[PDB]
Amino acid sequence: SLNRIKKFWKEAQYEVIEHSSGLKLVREWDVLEQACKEQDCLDLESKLTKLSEIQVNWVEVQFYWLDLYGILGENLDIQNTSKFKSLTSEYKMITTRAFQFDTTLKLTIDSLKMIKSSLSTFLERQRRQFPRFYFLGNDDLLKIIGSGKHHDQVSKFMKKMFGSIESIIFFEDSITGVRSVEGEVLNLNEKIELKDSIQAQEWLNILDTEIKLSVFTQFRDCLGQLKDGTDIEVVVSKYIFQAILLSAQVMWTELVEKCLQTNEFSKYWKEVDMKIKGLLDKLNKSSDNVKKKIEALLVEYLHFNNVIGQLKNCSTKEEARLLWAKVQKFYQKNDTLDDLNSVFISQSGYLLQYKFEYIGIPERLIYTPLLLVGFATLTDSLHQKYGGCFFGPAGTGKTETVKAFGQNLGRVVVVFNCDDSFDYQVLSRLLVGITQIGAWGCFDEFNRLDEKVLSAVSANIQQIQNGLQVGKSHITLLEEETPLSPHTAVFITLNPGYRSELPENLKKSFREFSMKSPQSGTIAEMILQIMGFEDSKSLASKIVHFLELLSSKCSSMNHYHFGLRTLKGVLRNCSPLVSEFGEGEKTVVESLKRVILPSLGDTDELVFKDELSKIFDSSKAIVQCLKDAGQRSGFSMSEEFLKKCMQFYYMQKTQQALILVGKAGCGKTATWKTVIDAMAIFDGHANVVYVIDTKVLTKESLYGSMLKATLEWRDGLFTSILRRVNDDITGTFKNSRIWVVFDSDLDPEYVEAMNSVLDDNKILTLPNGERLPIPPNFRILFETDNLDHTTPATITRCGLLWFSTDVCSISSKIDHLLNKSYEALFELDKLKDLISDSFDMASLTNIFTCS
Amino acid sequence: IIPLGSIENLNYAQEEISKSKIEGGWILLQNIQMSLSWVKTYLHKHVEEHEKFKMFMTCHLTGDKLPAPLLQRTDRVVYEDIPGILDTVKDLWGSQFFISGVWSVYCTFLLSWFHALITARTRLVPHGFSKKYYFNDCDFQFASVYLENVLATNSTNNIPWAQVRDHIATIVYGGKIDEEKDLEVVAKLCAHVFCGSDNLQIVPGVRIPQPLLQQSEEEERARLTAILSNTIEPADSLSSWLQLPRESILDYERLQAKEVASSTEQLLQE
Ligand SMILES: Nc1ncnc2c1ncn2[C@@H]1O[C@H](COP(=O)(O)OP(=O)(O)OP(=O)(O)O)[C@@H](O)[C@H]1O
Ligand SMILES: Nc1ncnc2c1ncn2[C@@H]1O[C@H](COP(=O)(O)OP(=O)(O)O)[C@@H](O)[C@H]1O
């Protein structure tokens, strides 16, 4: 044993597995450590300790040298003199060590730890000179610093860095503006000269400061134009949406006060009626970004009209004061010369200041009284330097309400849509970032946390709220004296009993609220109003009542969902069908038949048809192409099969994540195969189909695995398909359709990684860190058997299609299989005829029902 | 008295128990449940010999599960207080001190009575409400701050009683309510209490006149304390002070008798 241990200790060697020069690596650590583990005894103990330290050396040098050979050894502005000399000294020393000393390797550990601490603290200099940097990881921020002269790597990371900016426009390497989510540009008051020797902090600070002063100046001149009597239609196309919104709100509040000091409302009501009618007329002919702009303005002006109409029917002055005080009002400060807080908002006699952060042009939540009460309780909690809270049933409009409040008060709330995937480090980092910036950090599904992370994050948020209440600048957090701007706050949302309430310490410093029932009537009414339909109220009441009776009188299936998200999807899907079917009841009937009909059974379908005929009143080229494609394929068009193919086609036309459910032999594979063939014949695009079974492939094969020892990544089959379709060397995927199918069950563990795909992000989440986009041409399709072990979250974010019965009769199966066998193969004619007359259905159905 | 909570609170608790193990003292760790993980590590490492060392715990029955071995190397006691509406009014009145004229302290007085009435109605689970709510003094603090902020803006005589009533019933005292009947009864009690009429009748016994236009705050506080001391608590307080039917409290007492007798008859089987 001793001889073997001595031979193993004296047999120290390495292997050549690294890339380029690199570092010679060593493997098989367990055997060496076991071999390593009274003067000779203490010498052997010291040798075992040295072997463990060599293992630590190898692990840390792999983890450091991967990033070093990536960025550190080929880039200098991340280490921009002391860091220069430290990096070159450690580089030459460890290169000599790898080319060829226990105290030498201990000093190597010390030097690598010092270099790691130096680079991390350099990152904290980045995150204190500009704390929006603190959203990013270490490697991503290193890449940001390294791309100091390219000036174009910040465009793709711009969404992650701020939260509402997608790209930056450029002009001879001088900044002119930035782009929003829907193509809206945010021009600056003045351009900034990008000097050759600059670092990211200074020009990013002047960038967001000029964003603040730019929206300030645009709001000021829009207010001046509105005070000059300028009409809204000409100013919609001129300035940015944020300034237009703030000017409209300020003008509405001031004018309604100047008309509320007396008792009259008809003049401003008629004026805003003419304004919204003209705004809709301008909407009916504008482009897409202008359509979104006028959409948001018409939402807000519908809110103004609703408030004015409610105020008109007040019986007494005190009723008018009650109803006006509960509505969110906007005020202005014409006395303070500072350009940061000239505008503030007031709700129920409170005071909160605006932030001058760009929100982009998001969809605006329809202003319902429940949303106003939620805004009132949040501003009541925020007046006392407390935190708001929300708990109730799932899908009742909590996170969207928080985002709406952030958009009104003018800050991008960083939504922490948390699940089991998130760890402590990202939550702590984003919480301290929200603390330092002064941007609100909302939590989504706080009950979903594990026990120890929930307790620890509860401790962190308790400490940050305690620091907010006493108003101290410095609060101990994450083992550092992190400064706290007095404008930060924390939010939370809950779904209890599905886990627990808030803990007692958080219950002491929070205000609970419940918003269990969203008012779907007014949301549907105003979404029909903005959609341009002739009868918004009647159609909205009809669709809500129909959905309620459908939910009441259907089967209690787990895959059913008839809440508010489905109705919003219906109304967001109506408009492309509206563009060719016109505006009326017929197009919304067709949309209901297109998105809600395919998810039902058979009794549910007859109930659906009966109710649709009760409350509501009630393409040949694609059908003919599908029939020809199936006839070429050898199938037969039964009415049920052709119908289900039609809903599948009309369903894939809009959505891009379709699942299919049915028993064995139902005919789902044939359905999507013949629809793909019809698509290839009709649209002219080439069609390629990829078949994957998600259960026989493990996760380490479906996506891949990081090597814990070899430090190498292997691309899984799904990931390899994604890379080879994203690169597009042949160029086929530009003019061809890609169709990957999942012909297996639905394992939750195999779809938690798919959750990024099934969301609207169209991105792949990996343990590596690299992200590749999902093209709109990419179509994920599923082929399952039952929905017993699938979460109700995934059935809503993606479409579902149900196969109630067999798509085709028996004789269709005989004919198809006869044709297939003949394809596999004057005698043929008579043999086929005698086979056919031997296949007499009159006795065949009898023998089948007797078998 | 020494509450737990943040890391500073934990260090203060450790220093205080070290001081009482050095020289003695009587320590009450109020609301120790809120720091459950720190309790599970620290108290276990502590207990599982100076003279005159006494310290107490403060947990909740409807809270997180305490460690079983910790409960077996101590002495567990429980305490239920009297539901004295008068007593809790006196306690909340003495807890506070009072600032904007005498309308502010009159509103704080009315708010203390409303909070006491709601807390008294809280205990009766099947009739007063629909579930076991948990009100406390933080809600009273928010309500008082809201009232002061309303009275600071419009100091005129026409006090917007409807606005503060709706804000109390919906946003302040209606935050923890999920269903409709509890919100309805809280709104009804807000209408009864915060009416601000010529003479308010919270209970058939005592009446609270509104302050006039010349009262100073010291003698107004004296007058309100005097009208506080003159009140009497009748034997039917649990049904007459909260506007509940006699049949309702009879139903509550017969359900109490039914559950205790069913428990005893289940005890006698084994
Ligand atoms: N019109 C038709 N005429 C004849 N046979 C048909 C027709 N349509 C579908 N089929 C039959 O459907 C079969 C495939 O059905 P299905 O989609 O259920 O297959 P699958 O992928 O094996 O399904 P599952 O995995 O759910 O068992 C084909 O083998 C074919 O014989
Ligand atoms: N004006 C509105 N009021 C209430 N809900 C809305 C409004 N507009 C949209 N919604 C819907 O509310 C949903 C938000 O649900 P959310 O509170 O996030 O559920 P969960 O918290 O369970 O994720 C969105 O999916 C959206 O469809």
Cβ A245 vs Cβ A253: under 8 Å: no
**Where are the alpha helices (H) located in A15-101, listed in sequence order?**
29-36, 39-70, 82-99
Question: Do the Cβ atoms of A392 and B60 come within 8 Å?
Answer: no
Going from the C-alpha of B264 to that of each of A17, A201, B261, B268, the distances in angstroms are: 78, 75, 5, 6
Q: Residue A514 contacts by C-beta under 8 Å, 6 or more apart in sequence?
A: A390, A391, A392, B175, B176, B177, B178
CB < 8 Å & 24+ apart, contacts of A811-818: A811/A839, A811/A841, A811/A844, A812/A635, A812/A636, A812/A638, A814/A839, A815/A636, A816/A634, A816/A635, A816/A636
CA gap A332, A334 in Å, rounded: 6
**Given the DSSP bridges, would you call strands A352-353 and A414-417 parallel, antiparallel or unpaired?**
unpaired
Q: How many angstroms is the resolution?
A: 4.0
Residue A344, helix vs strand vs coil: strand
Instruction: Name the residue among A194, A190, A297 with its Cα closest to residue A246.
Output: A297
Report the number of secondary-structure helices (H) and strands (E) in chain B. 11, 4
CA gap A696, A700 in Å, rounded: 11
Question: Do the Cβ atoms of A505 and B35 come within 8 Å?
Answer: yes
Cβ A779 vs Cβ A737: under 8 Å: yes
Q: Residue A428 contacts by C-beta under 8 Å, 6 or more apart in sequence?
A: A457, A460, A478
The encoded tokens of residue A441 equal 């950090």
Using CB atoms within 10 Å of the CB of residue A59, give its burial: 0 to 12 exposed, 13 to 18 middle, 19+ buried. middle
Q: Residue A824 contacts by C-beta under 8 Å, 6 or more apart in sequence?
A: none
DSSP A799: E
State CA A845 to chain mean position distance: 53
CA gap A170, A194 in Å, rounded: 11
Q: Which residue among A405, A564, A566, A572 has the greatest number of ligand 2 atoms within 8 angstroms of its CB, and so is best to mutate?
A: A564
Element (DSSP H or E) covering residue B27: strand B25-28
CA gap B173, A507 in Å, rounded: 15
A830 alpha carbon – ligand 1 mean position (Å)? 29
CA atoms within 13 A on the CB side of A288: 5
Cβ A566 vs Cβ A574: under 8 Å: no
Using a CB-CB cut-off of 8 Å, the residues of chain A touching B167 are 348, 376
CB atoms within 10 A of CB A840: 10
**Given the DSSP bridges, would you call strands A329-332 and A343-346 parallel, antiparallel or unpaired?**
antiparallel
Provide Rg for chain A, Cα atoms.
Answer: 32
CA atoms within 13 A on the CB side of A693: 4
**Given the DSSP bridges, would you call strands A686-692 and A736-742 parallel, antiparallel or unpaired?**
parallel
Residue type for position A23: L
Using a CB-CB cut-off of 8 Å, the residues of chain A touching B163 are 321-322, 325, 348
Residue type for position B68: A
CB atoms within 10 A of CB A769: 9
Strands of A778-782's sheet, edge to edge? A686-692, A736-742, A778-782, A657-661, A799-802
> Residues A163, A374, A368, A279: is their CA dihedral positive or negative?
negative
Region class of A833: left (phi > 0), else alpha (psi between -120 and 50), else beta: alpha
CA gap A786, A90 in Å, rounded: 59
| Torsions phi, psi for A250 (to 5 deg) | -65, -45
DSSP A36-48: H--HHHHHHHHHH
Element (DSSP H or E) covering residue B141: helix B137-153
CA gap A302, A271 in Å, rounded: 13
State CA B35 to chain mean position distance: 22
The encoded tokens of residue A741 equal 């199918």
CA gap A609, A99 in Å, rounded: 79
Question: Do the Cβ atoms of B142 and A513 come within 8 Å?
Answer: no
Strands of A174-179's sheet, edge to edge? A167-171, A174-179, A185-193
CA gap A463, A480 in Å, rounded: 13
* Helical pair B137-153 and A369-383, crossing angle rounded to 10 deg: 100
Instruction: Name the residue among A275, A295, A312, A244 with its Cα closest to residue A529.
Output: A295
Contact with chain B for residue A406, Cβ under 8 A: no
Question: Do the Cβ atoms of B178 and A348 come within 8 Å?
Answer: no
A454 alpha carbon – ligand 1 mean position (Å)? 48
Going from the C-alpha of A789 to that of each of A274, A744, A746, the distances in angstroms are: 54, 13, 7
A808 alpha carbon – ligand 1 mean position (Å)? 9
Question: Do the Cβ atoms of A376 and B63 come within 8 Å?
Answer: no
CA gap B76, B93 in Å, rounded: 31
CA gap A7, A15 in Å, rounded: 18
The encoded tokens of residue B121 equal 């109605």
Cβ A379 vs Cβ A347: under 8 Å: yes
Cβ A67 vs Cβ A135: under 8 Å: no
| Torsions phi, psi for A416 (to 5 deg) | -100, 75
CA gap A398, A494 in Å, rounded: 9
A450 alpha carbon – ligand 2 mean position (Å)? 25
DSSP B180: S
Contact with chain B for residue A384, Cβ under 8 A: yes
DSSP A610-625: HHHHHHS---HHHHHH
Contact with chain B for residue A348, Cβ under 8 A: yes
| Torsions phi, psi for A765 (to 5 deg) | -95, 130
Instruction: Name the residue among B161, B189, B162, B159 with its Cα closest to residue B174.
Output: B189
Element (DSSP H or E) covering residue A599: none
Question: Do the Cβ atoms of B163 and A350 come within 8 Å?
Answer: no
CA gap A647, A642 in Å, rounded: 9
**Which residue in the block uniquely carries the two structure tokens 């709104």?**
B187
The encoded tokens of residue A668 equal 């789902």
Beta-bridge mates of residue A15:
A25
Q: Which residues of A are annotated as a binding site for ATP?
A: 392-399, 662-669
CA gap A83, A57 in Å, rounded: 22
Q: How far is A659 from chain B (nearest CA, A)?
A: 36
Residue A686, helix vs strand vs coil: strand
Q: Which residues of A330-363 are buried (b: 16+ CB within 10 A; e: fewer)?
A: bbbeeeeeeeeebbbbbbbbbebebbbbbbbbbb
Question: Do the Cβ atoms of B162 and A512 come within 8 Å?
Answer: no
A669 alpha carbon – ligand 1 mean position (Å)? 6
DSSP A706: B
Find the residues whose C-beta lies inside 6 A of ligand 2. Answer: A 365-366, 368, 371, 394-400, 444, 493, 518, 523, 564-565, 568
Going from the C-alpha of A708 to that of each of A177, A574, A704, A705, the distances in angstroms are: 44, 50, 13, 9
Contact with chain B for residue A516, Cβ under 8 A: yes
Beta-bridge mates of residue A481:
A476
Ligand nearest to the CA of A392: 2
Residue A61, helix vs strand vs coil: helix
CB atoms within 10 A of CB A680: 18
CA gap A311, A257 in Å, rounded: 12
Cβ B34 vs Cβ A508: under 8 Å: yes
CB < 8 Å & 24+ apart, contacts of A140-143: A140/A769, A142/A67, A142/A71, A142/A78, A143/A71
Cβ A613 vs Cβ A605: under 8 Å: no
DSSP B75-136: ----------HHHHHHHHHHH-----TTHHHHHHHHHHHHHHHHHHHHH-TTTT-SS-----
Using CB atoms within 10 Å of the CB of residue A539, give its burial: 0 to 12 exposed, 13 to 18 middle, 19+ buried. buried
DSSP A447: G
The encoded tokens of residue A682 equal 């009709």
CA gap A401, A416 in Å, rounded: 14
Instruction: Name the residue among A726, A648, A646, A738 with its Cα closest to residue A689.
Output: A738
DSSP A15: B
Q: Which residue among A802, A811, A813, A823 has the greatest number of ligand 1 atoms within 8 angstroms of its CB, and so is best to mutate?
A: A813
CA gap A71, A137 in Å, rounded: 15
Please provide the distance, in angstroms rounded to a whole number, between the alpha carbons at the two ends of chain A. 74
